[PDB]
Design a protein around this ligand. Structure first.
Ligand SMILES: Nc1ncnc2c1ncn2[C@@H]1O[C@H](COP(=O)(O)OP(=O)(O)O)[C@@H](O)[C@H]1O
Length: 308
């Protein structure tokens, strides 16, 4: 029964909140994925009539290995032990019925990459998205990243597809919602269930793909790329290049151009996140204060977003 250790007390499955299977109702499939399903559901505590708890339910496929099972359990542990408004909450688990459930904060606005793509200013459907919407999301995630850093957790896979939004409209809050990669390295010493084609090399600094060195400065680099993803409104990093081209480009000093219409101050922040020497990269407290400076500048927040 493997333990998990964070900040830096210890826990195990025994410390997960086991919710009675009979209390959980699945409403709809929310996409899914290749390994496991995600549903919108309800937990009817205690059971009642209502107001029940709205949740996202992650399933473990019932045909899986012992290692898969431990991996699923580990994800539960990692997530439950966080306490940050910019990190998705784990509501509990349902491990004593099959298939196994993890129950997470329902994030109604979906993943960040998809949200951006789906809400890009278009006309027909008008411009209900502006520069400050983008800056707030960047601050939200910076805030969560800072909490990981201060508690010495390396995420390893910061990326818009791994961030989620509480809702689509104004008032949305962006949160980090995926810890699969962190879990994997925690479990073996390395990327055992992956391989090279599965690495997020486009979000990795040179010391990371070259040496397998990860520190909180490697998340900083990843964050820079996230920013570009946000300010490009959900484009793939290094638009024309493959993984290898990117690894060659970045190694030789190459860096992405600013996204269309990106204010200089925001771009400056990305370029500092991508300094070659990790020691030259800002930590998350500096990144936050910088994104707040951008927030205060009318010339940045008054800038129009492109219309594709
Ligand atoms: N807490 C949540 N609320 C709403 N949607 C979610 C939540 N967690 C994941 N999803 C979405 O459900 C789908 C499947 O998730 P999954 O395949 O496990 O991907 P990931 O590894 O990025 O979490 C994706 O579209 C994902 O963004």
């Amino acid at each position: 029964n493997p333990n998990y250790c964070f900040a830096g007390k210890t826990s195990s499955i025994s410390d997960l909140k086991e919710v009675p299977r009979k209390n959980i109702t699945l409403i709809r499939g929310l996409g899914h994925g290749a390994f496991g399903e995600v549903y919108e559901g309800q937990v009817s505590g205690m059971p009642n009539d209502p107001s029940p708890l709205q949740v996202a339910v992650k399933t473990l496929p019932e045909v899986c290995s012992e290692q898969d099972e431990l991996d699923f359990l580990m994800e539960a542990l990692i997530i439950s032990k966080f306490n940050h408004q910019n990190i998705v909450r784990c509501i509990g688990v349902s491990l004593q019925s099959l298939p196994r459930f993890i129950l997470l904060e329902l994030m109604a606005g979906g993943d960040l990459k998809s949200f951006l793509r789906e809400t890009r200013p278009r006309p027909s459907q008008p411009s209900s998205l502006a520069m400050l919407d983008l800056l707030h999301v960047a601050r939200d995630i910076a805030c969560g990243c800072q909490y990981l850093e201060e508690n010495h957790f390396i995420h390893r896979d910061i990326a818009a597809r791994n961030c989620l939004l509480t809702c689509p409209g104004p008032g949305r809050v962006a949160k980090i919602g995926d810890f699969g990669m962190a879990r994997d390295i925690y479990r073996a010493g390395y990327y055992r269930k992956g391989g090279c084609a599965m690495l997020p090399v486009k979000w990795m600094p040179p010391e990371a793909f070259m040496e397998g060195i990860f520190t909180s400065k490697t998340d900083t680099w990843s964050f820079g790329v996230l920013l570009w993803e946000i300010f490009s409104l959900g484009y793939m990093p290094y638009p024309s290049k493959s993984n290898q081209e990117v690894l060659e480009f970045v190694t030789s000093g190459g860096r992405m151009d600013p996204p269309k219409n990106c204010p200089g101050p925001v771009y400056r922040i990305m370029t500092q996140c991508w300094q070659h020497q990790p020691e030259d990269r800002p930590n998350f407290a500096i990144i936050l204060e910088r994104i707040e400076y951008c927030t205060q500048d009318p010339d940045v927040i008054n800038t129009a977003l492109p219309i594709e």
